[PDB]
Structure 1
Amino acid sequence: KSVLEQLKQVTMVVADTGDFELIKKYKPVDATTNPSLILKAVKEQKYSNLVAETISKVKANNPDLNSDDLVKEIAIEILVSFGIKILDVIEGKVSSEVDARVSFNSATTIDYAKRIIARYESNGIPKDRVLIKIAATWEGIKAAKLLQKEGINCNLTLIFDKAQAKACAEAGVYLVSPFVGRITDWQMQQNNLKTFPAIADDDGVNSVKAIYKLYKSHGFKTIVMGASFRNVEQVIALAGCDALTISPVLLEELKNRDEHLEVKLTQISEADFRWLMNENAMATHKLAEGIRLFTKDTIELENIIKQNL
């Protein structure tokens, strides 16, 4: 058995891509998108017809919207159209991320999430097949608490800190996506490291291990999904995690190796949360950075939509 197939025995394998054509090579259970991956699927142009049809559809269904509102509605429908194509090739769920610009507004986050779900449902996809990805700021967590109460399952993303993860679980979220790679990136930058750290010393791997241990010892039922990978050894290190979302490149690396895979993994108030985050210099920087960078990619996507109206 390949390492990929070994991993599937102990972990829910998830594909991290909007390039739905790649997903059948790997037979993951679930798939995840993010604003950068949607932009890449739009930019690389394998799906220009899907984009063009989406734009036409939204214009016809929305004669009342001005150019700004129309572009926003198209951005949502693009996210959903990719998700629908992904759902055609997997048995599980797809994750679709809200506009990062709403990250500090629980209200607009709730509305955005509900609009994504409504668009899926209008296209005949039931909400049980979708996770709404939300950056794990306090405001995102508070939004997810409400959405979960209303039956909308959330994927809390940009998780860099254990207390941050704990708060998510306290809110009853379906799933959390603690990051690995971006933490390793910070670690390597801090000391100008030229090579990846040994696995035992990899701050990103250790961050997910710590969250896993917290959740299992405490009996939290939220799914732990490691995300953000720089090398295949980081993914292998976390075998046994509830779920791991993995790029098509790294899925291919796992598919082509066949050594033995060792299985390794077997209330907070607002003020408390803000304090614990502030104590984590890396998490404070990297949460903020993720929201800035995803916003830049969403603006690039909007500019592409505008050029094709």
Structure 2
Amino acid sequence: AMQKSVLEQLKQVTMVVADTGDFELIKKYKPVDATTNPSLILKAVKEQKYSNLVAETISKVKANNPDLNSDDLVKEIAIEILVSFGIKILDVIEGKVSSEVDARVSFNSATTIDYAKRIIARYESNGIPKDRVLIKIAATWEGIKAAKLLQKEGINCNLTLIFDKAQAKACAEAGVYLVSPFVGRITDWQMQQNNLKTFPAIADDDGVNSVKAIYKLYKSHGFKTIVMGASFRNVEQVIALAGCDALTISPVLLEELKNRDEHLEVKLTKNDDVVTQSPQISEADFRWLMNENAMATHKLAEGIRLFTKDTIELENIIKQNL
């Protein structure tokens, strides 16, 4: 782009997003948006780098909530930590930050809505308007149902743990602001199931193909939901999706892209394919389609379990630091 790095070239055709809670690293890549999740928040808390911020948040919450029991206090500290890191991130980017609801409410639309609103309220109390936040929700049928209601009230959501086109279609039909189709975890399944000794070629990469299929689906149907590829194993997977609406990338891979200097060929583009529109997917059809996809059924469930485990670990760290 005047002999620019792959990272700089990529920013011209795709919205680059940093996938991290480590806000000090964000400055060296200059992404538009940033994304966090329970695993990334745990990592930012557990590491010594932001020990002061964590200590201050714990103190503040204890002081402002003297009437809460130990369990309630811990949950309140956990949400303020989520939001505190979100605010530090917003201070270094021009865009939005994604903050994820407690994974334990993934099968309850009502409590997902409650948690989403609590996150928004904590940001508001800290002087941050909702226009800069995306509430991240696991794309289970219940999560999509909750997002549908949240969007009607002007709360933008980021539907995550997307492994199947059926999820992506129901999300778009719910008027969701953005979806995070996973790439890497899909490729993990592929390599284990097929005992692959080396990484699959881009043309054969199940993860890259999933995002390409969702992108095509959305554009051909005129859905305005943002397609953001997430979870990457190498820069080649990211580069293969150049042109996608957005891509959220780890600091490790952003560093690699910053140091790559070959010409970037754009792969995903807009077409003149007359828009087509099908009937919305019902709960029963969605559940059947997800069941037919062994990988998606496993990885959606696993993703929720893993985030739950990391949330429980965070709670234990908080309890040991009261």
**TM-score for both structures, normalised by structure 1:** 0.99
Q: Where does the alignment leave 5 or more consecutive residues of structure 2 unmatched?
A: 269-279
Q: Give the secondary-structure state (helix, strand or coil) at the position aligned to 1:172.
A: coil
Aligned counterpart in structure 2 of residue 12 of structure 1, from 11, 15, 35: 15
Q: Where does the alignment leave 5 or more consecutive residues of structure 1 unmatched?
A: none
1:239 corresponding residue in structure 2: 242
* Residues 183-211 of structure 1: per-residue CA shift (max 9 Å, x gap): 00000110222211000000000000000
**Partner Cα separation in structure 2 for residue 53 and residue 249 of structure 1:** 28
- In angstroms, what is the RMSD of aligned CA positions? 0.5
Aligned counterpart in structure 2 of residue 268 of structure 1, from 281, 285, 290: 281
Matched, 1:220 2:233: no
1:124 Cα deviation from its structure 2 partner: 0.3
**Partner Cα separation in structure 2 for residue 115 and residue 193 of structure 1:** 45
Q: Give the secondary-structure state (helix, strand or coil) at the position aligned to 2:29.
A: coil
* Residues 203-238 of structure 1: per-residue CA shift (max 9 Å, x gap): 000000000000000000000000000001000000
* Residues 135-163 of structure 1: per-residue CA shift (max 9 Å, x gap): 00000000000110111100000000001
* Residues 43-93 of structure 1: per-residue CA shift (max 9 Å, x gap): 112111100110111111112211001100110000000000000000000
Q: Give the secondary-structure state (helix, strand or coil) at the position aligned to 1:133.
A: strand
1:42 Cα deviation from its structure 2 partner: 0.8
- Deviation >2 Å, runs of 4+: none
Q: Give the secondary-structure state (helix, strand or coil) at the position aligned to 2:12.
A: helix
Q: Which moved more, 1:63-72 or 1:17-26?
A: 63-72
1:181 Cα deviation from its structure 2 partner: 0.2
**Partner Cα separation in structure 2 for residue 146 and residue 299 of structure 1:** 28
Q: Give the secondary-structure state (helix, strand or coil) at the position aligned to 1:63.
A: coil
Matched, 1:24 2:27: yes
* Residues 245-302 of structure 1: per-residue CA shift (max 9 Å, x gap): 000000010000110111000x111111111101111100000000000100100100
**Partner Cα separation in structure 2 for residue 169 and residue 216 of structure 1:** 11
1:76 corresponding residue in structure 2: 79
**Partner Cα separation in structure 2 for residue 35 and residue 178 of structure 1:** 17
2:210 corresponding residue in structure 1: 207
Aligned length: 308
**Partner Cα separation in structure 1 for residue 115 and residue 67 of structure 2:** 19
**Partner Cα separation in structure 2 for residue 45 and residue 169 of structure 1:** 40
**Partner Cα separation in structure 2 for residue 294 and residue 189 of structure 1:** 22
Q: Give the secondary-structure state (helix, strand or coil) at the position aligned to 1:152.
A: coil
Q: How high is the sequence identity, in percent, across the aligned residues?
A: 100
**Partner Cα separation in structure 2 for residue 175 and residue 135 of structure 1:** 12
1:107 Cα deviation from its structure 2 partner: 0.8
1:230 corresponding residue in structure 2: 233
